Symmetry: D3
Subunit: 240 residues, 6 copies
């Protein structure tokens, strides 16, 4: 759910704190001192997206407004923690995604830029979009539509276009682009349907469909729609 992902997170944090004295202050600052997942998540992102021109204090306020003006955002964060947890068997702790995984952080920071975008506060959405790219090395245009249960593993170098759509339970690895072919304007980015898995370095270009539960091979260049439950691979990509 959400309140109980929070509780499991709080309960792990106390243990983790007990077993690692060099990291207690860290567990207290990021999780233990907060009352809800929102307080913690905002504290983390604001600190991580912070810089000398726009300090953490100035960014937290901005994040907490979006959390109050749209609490679903936090729920979507909770569904993401669960996703990474259940889809990356190397992850056992519920707190791990929240504390350490930059992909997860970029996803949740993007949700905030999307909210701002839909509120027409574009210069602020752009500022964050790009600071997200600096901190996490993930560039998601605020206008993309991204569901929940999302996992951006390792994440470095992922780029997502303005008109891209990413449905629920999608997993994307490092270096993939959901970009364009060349049509400078209009619907021109991929529509990645549910359950899709995208291999490291894959380039998906155009306003084309990636059928649900498809698998996209590492480094493939996907230029044509992909049938559901199929595997595409190669350069350019073909079903195999």
């Amino acid at each position: 759910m959400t309140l109980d992902v929070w509780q499991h997170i709080r309960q792990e944090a106390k243990e983790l704190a007990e077993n690692e004295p060099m990291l207690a202050s860290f567990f207290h600052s990021t999780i233990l001192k907060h009352q809800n997942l929102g307080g913690a998540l905002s504290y983390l992102l604001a600190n991580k997206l912070a810089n000398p021109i726009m300090p953490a204090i100035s960014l937290r306020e901005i994040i907490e407004e979006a959390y109050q003006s749209n609490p679903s955002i936090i729920d979507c964060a909770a569904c993401d923690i669960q996703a990474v947890r259940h889809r990356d068997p190397a992850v056992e702790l519920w707190s791990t995604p929240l504390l350490y995984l930059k992909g997860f952080h970029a996803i949740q920071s993007y949700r905030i830029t999307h909210y701002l975008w839909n509120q027409n506060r574009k210069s602020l959405a752009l500022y964050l979009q790009n600071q997200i790219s600096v901190a996490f090395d993930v560039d998601i245009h605020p206008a993309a539509k991204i569901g929940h249960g999302i996992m951006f593993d390792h994440a470095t170098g992922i780029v997502v276009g303005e008109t891209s759509v990413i449905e629920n339970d999608v997993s994307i690895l490092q270096g993939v682009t959901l970009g364009g072919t060349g049509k400078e304007s209009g619907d021109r980015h991929p529509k990645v349907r549910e359950g899709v898995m995208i291999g490291a370095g894959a380039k998906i270009l155009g306003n084309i469909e990636v059928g649900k539960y498809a698998k996209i091979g590492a480094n493939s260049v996907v230029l044509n729609p992909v049938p559901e439950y199929a595997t595409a691979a190669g350069v350019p990509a073909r079903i195999v």
Copy 2:
């Protein structure tokens, strides 16, 4: 003119700050309190490249010395702005490249390293080269020869070699490498001629010529010279 670009930037920022209270101090610190593009660019790069050992205040002095010794560096920055603008229908504001795009930032920072390199202040050149890599995720060798009207779109993972040449109006997407095959010294990096557009993740290796206005497809490995206006794609690349 550089001066007109500045005038447009200032105008935009006055209205941008009107429309967004949360971000007004930002527009003010980055643009409105400055009297020309150089003071602004130096404030922006200094801050973005700053870190605990070499802070903003220490870096700005170096950048400002460079702009004063070679004024035209600012000129190329303004020509790169127009470029992104003209080449990206997504970018309506002149201020955007300047304030937010890490690729733009990486290029301008490189120009400073290039001036330092040509003046044989190479350790400083290497310092900045690498801090550009840390902050923007772009690694451009100071010896690289880069013209203007350039666009590093998204930019993450762009690596450019010591003997590479990039002439005007070139466009490079994330993940591309202009590198070598393994001759360890001498002229061994690409020659990207005017108007060339390089797709996301392309690897162009060797002292080979990439022809003006030629197009390189995503994830293509280019090991052979590409004719002007031609399109190269595949791994290895072939003329399509």
Copy 3:
């Protein structure tokens, strides 16, 4: 020998500091004021991994305990220095790898995480794994087994799986992944043997053998064992 590398680095530093006044305090803070390489390295890594939640002062004490429980980690560092040095004719000074190259840094930082992993201090190793990802854009799982004389050139986008092995004298470029094909647990990552060189963007997936002195061509996708001294290239890769 370490003491000798250290000695070369110090004499280079006094020289460097004299020729570039603007960087003198830098050479003193990072090299001259320390009495051995671990002092320099720790100060350098602490400062680069520092963030507002865990400051340099806290990180340094963790790094220094590691260097005390295992002085050889510092020895592997001098070894990596020698390697970048003679495996790239563009690096001439011994101080260069230590002071500037994020690949070098990510690797020595990973060594600390690896020692933490074997001390069963995983929350800490995980924290650092991911800060290294944020700071240098290199994501190496603490459990990976890596030798010395290692070169991570440019480094941006390198991801190394939990069960990966990277023997001595290997060179890896930007964008390469050492990952899995989808077996969720158990041995599932690459065993890269000695002397191997991996080109830009290659993705090597699966618990497969990459024979000593093998060479992987850029953007390749290696899914089958690669013979010793063989060259592989393509999507998917073929012994070439």
Copy 4:
């Protein structure tokens, strides 16, 4: 009224920013981007009381829970702002006490510590009392009872004891101590009545009455009750 004061301050801010481009960002971050006085006051205070161990972001959440449990601390601030402005002919703008006067900052900070203390959250009240001393050079025991319309002019070196009382519209200059004589416990500090003005350097020791509207001359040491509207001066002091 607080909203009145808030209004004049916002108004001054817009004009202040307009008249000094170099400080516009400061005006926007401290006053303009906030919707009320507590928001601005919490930002100014968290920022100024910040330190490497407890940064602004951590302190502002604390100041804000206090403003929420006891909104009347904010009113008192407004009232204190009216006082400096109207007892200091040299302060013409409402925004001045709020933005620049450490005496004013010290007082509103103590107020937070007072609330905490009565909430029996003493370690937190003590942490703040002492950071207030470090930042503003005013040391005020949290248990002290301090009214409104108070002016701590210049403020440097003011010290207020645990059992002290300071009623409304009192003025206190730099270097004054409201302390004790040596009775180590119990009511043992000055009762400073309304409208009382204390000149620079005076030491007022013991559980004694300082009469309503009395005046203490500089450097006097007051060890005996002071009649209302009377002037005391000398070492020791005597009614003059």
Copy 5:
């Protein structure tokens, strides 16, 4: 004694952390994560004295060297903690002097400057003496000889001269100077003997004796030797 004071401090910290979640990180960072009192003290001082040109990381290494080469400093720290605890009735906890009191902090910082002075590393001693004056508003020349059991209560504006001597169990309040009359060189500062209590604002000028257990009245100017167990007062000071 040192190890016992340290355990009581560790014991209170664990308790204080449980009772104030908002401050737990602070208690772990300042106390709990350290193995001894010297590791905690150094963390505190390095952080408090820190500034943008000489960061905490750099100061800590300098303080730890001193504690390594002369361990008694920490012991004198424990003895001071004890002092404030038996001499200020308004101070229950052992952890308080160590965690919040700037006079305590100033004193411990001076001990490091006195050590460096005695090792003739005078630039380092002067840098700190002055940074101690900036952070705690206490200016103690490194050459003064100060014993233990010392209590600088409130402390703002305390100034101690080059040849001053302060013996064990002395108490000094805010604003006092142990200074000179004007002989520009030689022995020229007060010799404050054991058990002396100096009231707020007193100025003790000259190389005169302040007899053991003497009491100096607030704001007094002491220009002549003071008899033991006597009480001096006035400007200029005379007995009782």
Copy 6:
């Protein structure tokens, strides 16, 4: 000459750096990397005055503007340096006032606020005045008229009124106030003529003349004019 004071400062700095490796970075950032006193001083003051809202990089540009418009200001700094050099036999290095004495730092910082005040940039003058009070614990109204050859020894707690006049070669100790009696406006502060020396804690109130080369005793309250070369002591002060 200012240039000779500079050459001497550089000279000492080069040797100080040789002798103290822990502070070499400091000598280099503060002195050796600059080309004139202006550069060093602006760098020093910008860092000392920086805070989270108004960073070092933002303040230096303010100071450098001031130095470029009234170069005489730097000349006044060199004069204040020599003054501390021989009026304080404890100080023999020309670099000491410059690098470590906060009273010097405050005087020089005041000069910048005075230039700003006389240019009607009063909000900027007020921001600095008070940041000077927080940084150095010295509060000097920007309008006060101060000459050169000044020395504020220790300096803590010095407060100087709006109409105060301080001519050349004056010496002021900690805790002294040049303040008013209560006439709320007009000419209401002391006129301190040349060579005057003021003891610690003295309070001089009202528009009264302190005659050249007069001497003021510690803790005095001067309420009546002081003849040239006279000595005044007491509460109130009498002529001695």
